[PDB]
């Protein structure tokens, strides 16, 4: 269902619909099912309604409302500067241009751009995908999946039990007291980093299968590095404990000491 240069009202039904507003200020109502909505140019109002809907939005096109409705909905800015978005506060704006903004409501997941983005989740379960560029990803509460992809990314799952995929490039992972049970999955990078804001002597390092497990004594908090021992591509090269740094040789010492 494709609009034209007029201000259109386009309404899908119960199936998986593809709605595109074209030019002008459109209203798109996806109905039930897993819809794909694009406002295109103009200032558009975009309602995914029930189902797991997808929104294709240019971060530089300001003045739209993207409303996922019920279900697990994704906003995608990947179709130049990056995007700053917050699912908790409910906005997305052009990096380097806060006045160029869009309203986000009822959206659970976000895909960024090939440029440097900042993607912030909310207290629910979120998937945040930075794609290329040097991105900052913050999960907030709830159980999140963060994908840094290519580039030098900063990942923090925050509270809840999070999966952190830094991707290729030199990635930094944040962890601390109250961060729950997080797992890191590394694919590549000669200088990945973990920064743990625990007191260093709260930390307990252990090998569990082929994983490295880092616990904070006194808490239920644990950071697992998946397949650490299986291959060098899955390792992080520096671990910081508060203001103290440890290398792989140093980590293995701590493990062996137990
Ligand atoms: Ca139109
Ligand atoms: Ca539909
Ligand atoms: Ca829908
Ligand atoms: Ca638009
Ligand atoms: Ca439009
Ligand atoms: Ca929806
Ligand atoms: Ca939703
Ligand atoms: Ca990016
Ligand atoms: Ca990235
Ligand atoms: Ca979250
Ligand atoms: Ca989280
Ligand atoms: Ca990366
Ligand atoms: Ca990496
Ligand atoms: Ca966490
Ligand atoms: Ca590495």
UniProtKB/Swiss-Prot annotation:
Per-repeat ranges for Hemolysin-type calcium-binding: 2-19, 20-37, 38-55, 59-75, 120-137, 138-155, 156-173, 186-203
Post-translational changes noted in the entry: Released in a processed form.
Domain of life: Bacteria
Subcellular location: Secreted
Function: Bifunctional adenylate cyclase toxin-hemolysin that plays a crucial role in host colonization. It causes whooping cough by acting on mammalian cells by elevating cAMP-concentration and thus disrupts normal cell function.
UniProt free text on domains: The Gly-rich region is probably involved in binding calcium, which is required for target cell-binding or cytolytic activity.
Family the entry assigns: In the N-terminal section; belongs to the adenylyl cyclase class-2 family. In the C-terminal section; belongs to the RTX prokaryotic toxin family.
UniProt protein name: Bifunctional hemolysin/adenylate cyclase
Record organism: Bordetella pertussis (strain Tohama I / ATCC BAA-589 / NCTC 13251)
Residues represented out of the complete protein: 1410 to 1675 of 1706
């Amino acid at each position: 269902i494709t609009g034209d240069a007029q201000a259109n009202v386009l309404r899908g039904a119960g199936g998986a619909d593809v709605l595109a507003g074209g030019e002008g200020d459109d209203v798109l109502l996806g109905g039930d099912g897993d819809d794909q909505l694009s406002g295109d140019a103009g200032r558009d109002r975009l309602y995914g309604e029930a189902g797991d809907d997808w929104f294709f939005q240019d971060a530089a096109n300001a003045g739209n409302l993207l409303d996922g409705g019920d279900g697990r909905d994704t906003v995608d800015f990947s179709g130049a500067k990056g995007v700053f978005l917050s699912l908790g506060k409910g906005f997305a704006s052009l990096m380097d241009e806060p006045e160029t903004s869009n309203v986000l409501r009822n959206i659970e997941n976000a895909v960024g751009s090939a440029r440097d983005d900042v993607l912030i989740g909310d207290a629910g379960a979120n998937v945040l995908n930075g794609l290329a560029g040097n991105d900052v990803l913050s999960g907030g509460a709830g159980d999140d999946v963060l994908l840094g992809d290519e580039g030098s990314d900063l990942l923090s799952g925050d509270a809840g039990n999070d999966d952190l995929f830094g991707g290729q490039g030199d990635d930094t992972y944040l962890f601390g007291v109250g961060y729950g049970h997080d797992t890191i999955y590394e694919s590549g990078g000669g200088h990945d980093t973990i920064r743990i804001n625990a007191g260093a002597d709260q930390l307990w390092f252990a090998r569990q299968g082929n994983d490295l497990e880092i616990r904070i004594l006194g808490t239920d908090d644990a950071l697992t590095v998946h397949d650490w021992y299986r291959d060098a591509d899955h390792r992080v090269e520096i671990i910081h404990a508060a203001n103290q740094a440890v290398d792989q040789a140093g980590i293995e010492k701590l493990v062996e000491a137990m």
